[PDB]
Amino acid sequence: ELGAINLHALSMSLQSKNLGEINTALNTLLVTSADSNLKISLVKYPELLDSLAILGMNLLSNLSQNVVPYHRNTSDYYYEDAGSNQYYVTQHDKMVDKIFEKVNNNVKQWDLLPEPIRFLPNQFPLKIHRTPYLTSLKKIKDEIDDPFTKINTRGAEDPKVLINDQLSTISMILRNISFSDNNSRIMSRNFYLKRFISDLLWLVLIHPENFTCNRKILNFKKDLVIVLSNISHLLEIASSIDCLLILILVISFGQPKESLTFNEFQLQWGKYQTFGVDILAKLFSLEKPNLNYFKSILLNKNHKDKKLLRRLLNLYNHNLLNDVVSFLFSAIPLQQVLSQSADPSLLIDQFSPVISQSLTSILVIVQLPFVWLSSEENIGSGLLKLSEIILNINNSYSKVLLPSINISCVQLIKCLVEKSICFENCLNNDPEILKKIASIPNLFPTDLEIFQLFTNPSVDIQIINQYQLLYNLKNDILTNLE
Amino acid sequence: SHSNIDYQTLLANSDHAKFTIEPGVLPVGIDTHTATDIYQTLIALNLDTTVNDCLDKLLNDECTESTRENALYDYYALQLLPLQKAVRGHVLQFEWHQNSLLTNTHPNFLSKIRNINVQDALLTNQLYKNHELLKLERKK
Amino acid sequence: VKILEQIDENWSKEDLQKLLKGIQEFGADWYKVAKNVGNKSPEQCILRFLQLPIEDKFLYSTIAFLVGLVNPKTVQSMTQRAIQSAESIKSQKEEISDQKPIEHIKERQMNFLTNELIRLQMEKLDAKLNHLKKLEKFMELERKTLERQQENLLIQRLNFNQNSSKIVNVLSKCLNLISDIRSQIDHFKSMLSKPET
Amino acid sequence: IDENWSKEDLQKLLKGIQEFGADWYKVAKNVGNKSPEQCILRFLQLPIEDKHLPFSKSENPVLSTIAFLVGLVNPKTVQSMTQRAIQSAESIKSQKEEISDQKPIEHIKEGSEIAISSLGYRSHIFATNEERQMNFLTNELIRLQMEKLDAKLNHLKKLEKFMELERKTLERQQENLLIQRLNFNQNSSKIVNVLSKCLNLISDSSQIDHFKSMLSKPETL
Amino acid sequence: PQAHEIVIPSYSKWFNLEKIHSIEVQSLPEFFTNRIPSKTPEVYMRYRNFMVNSYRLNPNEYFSVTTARRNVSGDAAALFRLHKFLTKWGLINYQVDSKLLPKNIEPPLTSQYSTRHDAPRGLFPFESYKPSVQLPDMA
Amino acid sequence: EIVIPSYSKWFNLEKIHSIEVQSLPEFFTNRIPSKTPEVYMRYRNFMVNSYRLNPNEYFSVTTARRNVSGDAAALFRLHKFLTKWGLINYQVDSKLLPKNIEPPLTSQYSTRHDAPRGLFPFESYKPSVQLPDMAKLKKMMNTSDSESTLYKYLKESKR
Amino acid sequence: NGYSGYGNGITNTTTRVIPQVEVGNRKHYLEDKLKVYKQAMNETSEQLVPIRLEFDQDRDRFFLRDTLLWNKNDKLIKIEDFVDDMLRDYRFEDATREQHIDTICQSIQEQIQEFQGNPYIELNQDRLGGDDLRIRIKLDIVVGQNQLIDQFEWDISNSDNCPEEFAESMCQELELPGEFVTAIAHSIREQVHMYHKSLALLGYNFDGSARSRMLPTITLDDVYRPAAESKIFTPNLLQISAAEL
Amino acid sequence: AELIPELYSFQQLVDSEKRLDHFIHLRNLHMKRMVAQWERSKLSQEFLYPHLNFPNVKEEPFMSYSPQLTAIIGLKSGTSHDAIFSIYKYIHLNELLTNDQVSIVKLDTQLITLLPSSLKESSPDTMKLTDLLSLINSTHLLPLLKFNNTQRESQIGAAELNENARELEQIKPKIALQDKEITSVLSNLHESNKRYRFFKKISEDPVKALNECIASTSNALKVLSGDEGYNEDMVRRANFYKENEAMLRENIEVILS
């Protein structure tokens, strides 16, 4: 609303008392919500973010430890005195006191600021919470009215819900802060913020029950993936755990039911399943020898951290990243190719290309004991018909069309050849594969289409080469089949 | 035949979704406000009785100046009671206010990105190209 | 009756004596009353004063656990007003009797026409699934057959047009050698005539 | 304390409640000028309104009946004509020993009351939840019927459409096949004819192998 | 002697010129590992109270760290650290400037306290009908 | 001649207590030639007798710096030591250091956004208790509202 | 309602955002301490550094004649930031180019770059109360309106004794209020350092006598307490005077 | 959203046929993808049909070629389209093309003899094949019942595709009605579920269930109206001996108050 001017509320937030925390947190949340003219600039801000992450870490911690803060019987919790000193004592003379002490009767370590993040003793990894968007109805069922709602829609008559909603509000305001330049202020350097993200993840998914309303869990997942969307730079300090966490977070969406495990999402409900692949591209483009490499180790099937990692993979039971493939294969098809026109496509088209980009990128990362193939009466590939659509569009938004179709073709050829050569190297399957490969209606654009293409547009040279080499591999497969 | 009076059978059935009632069951015991308010009143009634009691007791000087002082402090505290109740309510509402963190409402939180705009996609591509180019250069 | 307030510890009798004496004719001036007592912080007085019972008024239910609100009253809600006298063991033996009566009047929770229906549902489910998947794979294999054969025909045509063009280039080379379909027989007759010469 | 009855009163009471069961109006009619509740609380061994309790504040009254009323309502609702519970009636000595045991002011009575309350509840609960699961399975069967309709219509679509498409495609394919067959036949024949011709010409100076062989051979000179 | 009116940003109302609090140690731990004997909680408190007294003396006008450095020292570094720290926490150099206002009035005012619907603790605005008197009450 | 702290009543103005050497070892490394138990004896005896001269008035250390030109380090140290054992300066209440200040005690607080200083509840009232006045209405009187009336009702309707 | 967040503040305005209005003038710094401070100064601490500052000479126009200490074992402060804070504390013209700070930090790091704390006398040697060689420390200071001069033995070989104790002791004069004592110890840590620093240029930081100028610059055995007119250099005096410096 | 088609998460799964009708719905989605791709498949199969002109074996369109042409393809007649696709593949195989436009192809006597009269011999080029297409579309295509057959071609599959689409649309609204019924019965299931949960919980130990449902009803009454923090604690002893944050909060107050 109004009033509500200053920024320095951070001070009060930094303070460790329930009162100040409420007073600020609620206000500043309402603030960052308002945007008509209300934005949080950056001058000497950062202190805000620090304070925030510190607060969240401590609260979530002693929550996991199941102990209420803000109220004990200790206070001003260290030394209090006015002893024998003016300014400089505790030299040699101090031992005299010992002497004194021996005749009158007739060093420390200090912890760092935040607490540890993982290895927490009570918190030991047991598989829970790998459930899909379905829980919304759970949420409904939870939020459903019933003689036992236990939704204290009012304030904290008990501190548990207090901590819950506290963290909730913190998450929300954190989201709202994250919609501008000053993403650079958030850019992977608020080591505090990253610690917060990490441990929050490690809880929300490995969540021994302390969260009241599942809807709170949804909120957390949701604004979390959003604020991720507004990151386009490094992550994954103490990576591996965090990398797997983020993967499970994005996998949260899409309906499950070898073959593809994911019914493609009927695009009229959700918009987060978007954010998922959005991030899995953006925050994954960095070919720096860390992130890509973490997921590469995730191909496999302090030091205790490593124990954790495999500890979850077998606690997700073969391979798993096929699930990531299937997930990536959602939201593209079966609606635009089933519409009445190609214009309403362009909207979600804008969204589409990053997906194929992510896919082909991960296919640079698959070149060892596996069984993988993903064209088995599961998708076919309307990619060809889609390419034709965008082509006809070309000769009849923008700036994304040509790259989309190009990378679609590249995707096709690369996945084909990689499948073939992989099951060649293993050679655990009959040459029927060729015949199998030769048995796709969604495949190998007809040579007549190639020909007529070779004439009209004349504005697609690179694409012409794409189709050219594609058809080349096609004819090769035909020949060497016999 | 009849007796000016109707009755109920025992063989009918239920839609299981009825909306009819009847005072043939005697759930007499409609006791919500009555008992509540009489309890409330009785509180202050017996209170005032105690007030008058201690008052007269301390007034009767023939009683010991070791019983009196008791009754005097008693009347003090009793006549003071509403004050403590009031300031109690003050501080109570005050602390209760702390447990309010907008659970009451559920505003939108600026879920702006309906789609990721052009800038997102082209940014992905640009980052990829720049990164691979720096890679190519790293040995140059 | 006979409400005693000389009931506090860590504060002498006269402590609270002076306390209440002050607050009597001093009107909550906590500074005054703190001055008006023997070295206790004003907030201390406030707190202690705040914890002073009136233990003779609160009586130990439906109303005893609800205020400014209540269950309605036209039905049998007075069952609430009789909330408990032996709750645990009473309800325990009541469950005993309930299960007992269940087992007694009893002599799976469905009948046998029911079981017939159930088995029939199961069988229909199985049959529908089987029909579905069979017709599915059948269409699929038909499609694959048609496709394989289609691409076969395609490459066949390709190779044979190639062969035509090939022998065309060959006979062109031969015509060039002669230096020292219609056009085929034409060049052939021309070469034969040259040979006659 | 004792209550207004007689030997034969309670005798016929027992007899009829064994005869009819759970229909208190009926057995009540077997003894004129007797309320069903009378006959009910008497079996429960209970008098009428001679003692809230967790709330000294009680509803105002000068001549009425509240607690025992709902008590009897729940009781009669139980219909457990053989309710296994606090001592029941098979001989008046049961009541003798009950009174010999009934010595608490009310607390024992109250425990018994709430016990029978819970009992009637439990009975209605069992029955109701049984009906609930019944309704559940009914609704699910309805869902199945709907799915059946869906699948069936889809099957019809499948059969008709796709048999048509596959037939026509097969026809087109075979046409293409045989036509290109004869095309290549005409070709090969023509090629062989040309082979004979160029063979003659070179001599006067597949087999495409030997053709080109002799070709380059003559091409030497 | 006391001759000024000293206010502080309330949230600071955990500081006590007499004692120390877990807050500051988590913000200035370098006096508590007990590693450097020339430093101790004691000398810390000495510096602390000294500086806060200094500021509170003539708080209308500013006070510098350089001032204290001239006055007393065992270090420049830690001195500056804690000085700027207290600055942040406004315990020092907070009332360096004054600001005023005429403050016109509005329907709500601090001396306004009437009978009206209440969020606080229980209250009963309707007492008793006639037949309530029909009870053998307590005497 | 002059009483001292009772526990301190052990000194040897003519000898060296093991308490001394244990307290201060530096005079006993047998390495510093400029230092010896002898010169320390002279140190301490001079110091204490000097104070004994007019112990009614305090005696500082800088004097010793003026008077022996030993290392002021050990001088200051031993001086602190003897005061710690009250052997010196047991008749004085002065010689303190200035800050030209004293700890004040007045304070005020204001951090208004909306929540403290009250979350601004609605107004209320009710400082003092009130009278029911029903006691007379409840008092047994033959002019009872309904008390006598309902008594007569019972007695005329119970048949 | 009320108005307070930053100095009696204003919380009733046109509903804007204001970042950290705390400056006396350019006065808000708390940013970026938490992690670095914790991780850094949770470990041992060591020697300090005396520093003098002179910039008033007829090459630049200043009142820079102040001293202060420093921990060379520190890496927590952009020294220039500290300098600028000091300068703004000196109320100088905000233009810190005509009030060039670079020169100042240059002089600072220059002075710091000739230090080792006490030699192996502390680094590896440990002589109970040091060994010998109490320098006749000579200290004069000019504060407010009065100067004070003194000379006295003070060991260089001992570590067990810190300066500031001498400071608070000689505080027991008239008032020697505050501002005095600091410079004394500073001068002290100044005075001593150079000597062993110069001696560090040689090699006696372990052994006894040195090599030529250390001979006149020493105390002796002093087997007996002194005369009245020699130590009559030890005492101290407080004298008013018109300044000519 | 997800609520609208289904809610099946967990219901105690009593008589767990829910997995089975689940599978039914799954296979419905299967059939959905099936039919979708089948429509697309028929589209694709059509695609070639308007563009083919090979059928000759069972006005008359096969126009004869030129002596150059019968020297080139060895075929005498047909459509220009077939010839141009042939020479297209010819360029492809001989690879006389250039790729810096691409249609520039290095000319050869195998080709230039198609247009030797314009003194193209003066310049064997690498020129636009389009120029040749323009050249050979009438320059060498010249001359020197079965009307029913025009019927049996591309139009067939198009028409049957239209019929299939029409009958699918015909059946659609029945499906819509069934979906409405699904939603209805689902909501009813849902309510009945709530009721059963309630009732069995009552079966558990009616004392606690009664207390809790009563208190919840009261709380709902209140929240649906103005709200108050504490219904009680006029019993001061409890909430004040067993609580001390009162002290701190008070302290904060009195400073301002």
UniProtKB/Swiss-Prot annotation, chain A:
GO terms for molecular function: RNA polymerase II-specific DNA-binding transcription factor binding; transcription cis-regulatory region binding; zinc ion binding. The prion domain (PrD) is a Gln/Asn (Q/N)-rich domain, which is unstructured in its native, soluble form, and which forms a parallel in-register beta-sheet in its amyloid form. The first 37 residues of this domain are sufficient for aggregation, propagation, and transmission of the [SWI+] prion. A zinc finger (C4-type) spans 409-426. Keywords: Activator, Amyloid, DNA-binding, Metal-binding, Nucleus, Prion, Transcription, Transcription regulation, Zinc, Zinc-finger. GO terms for cellular component: chromatin; nucleus; SWI/SNF complex. GO terms for biological process: cellular response to amino acid starvation; chromatin remodeling; DNA-templated DNA replication; positive regulation of mating type switching; positive regulation of transcription by RNA polymerase II; regulation of transcription by RNA polymerase II. Component of the SWI/SNF global transcription activator complex. The 1.14 MDa SWI/SNF complex is composed of 11 different subunits: one copy each of SWI1, SNF2/SWI2, SNF5, SNF12/SWP73, ARP7/SWP61, ARP9/SWP59; two copies each of SWI3, SNF6, SNF11, SWP82; and three copies of TAF14/SWP29. This is SWI/SNF chromatin-remodeling complex subunit SWI1. It is found in: Nucleus. The keyword Thylakoid does not apply. Its main location: nucleus. Signal peptide: none annotated. It comes from the Eukaryota. Belongs to the SWI1 family. The chain holds residues 701 to 1314 of 1314 of the full protein.
UniProtKB/Swiss-Prot annotation, chain B:
It is found in: Nucleus. It comes from the Eukaryota. There is a cross-link at K85 (Glycyl lysine isopeptide (Lys-Gly) (interchain with G-Cter in ubiquitin)). Component of the SWI/SNF global transcription activator complex. The 1.14 MDa SWI/SNF complex is composed of 11 different subunits: one copy each of SWI1, SNF2/SWI2, SNF5, SNF12/SWP73, ARP7/SWP61, ARP9/SWP59; two copies each of SWI3, SNF6, SNF11, SWP82; and three copies of TAF14/SWP29. Involved in transcriptional activation. Catalytic component of the SWI/SNF complex, an ATP-dependent chromatin-remodeling complex, which is required for the positive and negative regulation of gene expression of a large number of genes. It changes chromatin structure by altering DNA-histone contacts within a nucleosome, leading eventually to a change in nucleosome position, thus facilitating or repressing binding of gene-specific transcription factors. Present with 217 molecules/cell in log phase SD medium. This is Transcription regulatory protein SNF2. The lineage of its organism: Eukaryota, Fungi, Dikarya, Ascomycota, Saccharomycotina. The gene is SNF2.
Curated annotation (Swiss-Prot), chain D:
It comes from the Eukaryota. The modification Phosphoserine is found at S112. One of its GO terms (biological process) is regulation of transcription by RNA polymerase II. Residues 149-177 are annotated as: Leucine-zipper. GO terms for cellular component: chromatin; cytosol; nucleus; SWI/SNF complex. Its main location: nucleus. Residues 1-51 form the SANT domain. GO terms for molecular function: DNA binding; histone binding. It is found in: Nucleus. Keywords: Activator, DNA-binding, Nucleus, Phosphoprotein, Transcription, Transcription regulation. Present with 3150 molecules/cell in log phase SD medium. Interacts with RTT102, SWP82 and the N-terminus of SNF2. Component of the SWI/SNF global transcription activator complex. The 1.14 MDa SWI/SNF complex is composed of 11 different subunits: one copy each of SWI1, SNF2/SWI2, SNF5, SNF12/SWP73, ARP7/SWP61, ARP9/SWP59; two copies each of SWI3, SNF6, SNF11, SWP82; and three copies of TAF14/SWP29. Involved in transcriptional activation. Component of the SWI/SNF complex, an ATP-dependent chromatin-remodeling complex, which is required for the positive and negative regulation of gene expression of a large number of genes. It changes chromatin structure by altering DNA-histone contacts within a nucleosome, leading eventually to a change in nucleosome position, thus facilitating or repressing binding of gene-specific transcription factors. This is SWI/SNF complex subunit SWI3. The chain holds residues 523 to 780 of 825 of the full protein.
Swiss-Prot record, chain H:
Transmembrane segments: none annotated. Coiled coil: none annotated. Disulfide bonds: none annotated. It is found in: Nucleus. It comes from the Eukaryota. To yeast RSC6. Interacts with SWP82. Component of the SWI/SNF global transcription activator complex. The 1.14 MDa SWI/SNF complex is composed of 11 different subunits: one copy each of SWI1, SNF2/SWI2, SNF5, SNF12/SWP73, ARP7/SWP61, ARP9/SWP59; two copies each of SWI3, SNF6, SNF11, SWP82; and three copies of TAF14/SWP29. PANTHER family: SWI/SNF-RELATED MATRIX-ASSOCIATED ACTIN-DEPENDENT REGULATOR OF CHROMATIN SUBFAMILY D. Involved in transcriptional activation. Component of the SWI/SNF complex, an ATP-dependent chromatin remodeling complex, which is required for the positive and negative regulation of gene expression of a large number of genes. It changes chromatin structure by altering DNA-histone contacts within a nucleosome, leading eventually to a change in nucleosome position, thus facilitating or repressing binding of gene-specific transcription factors. This is Transcription regulatory protein SNF12.
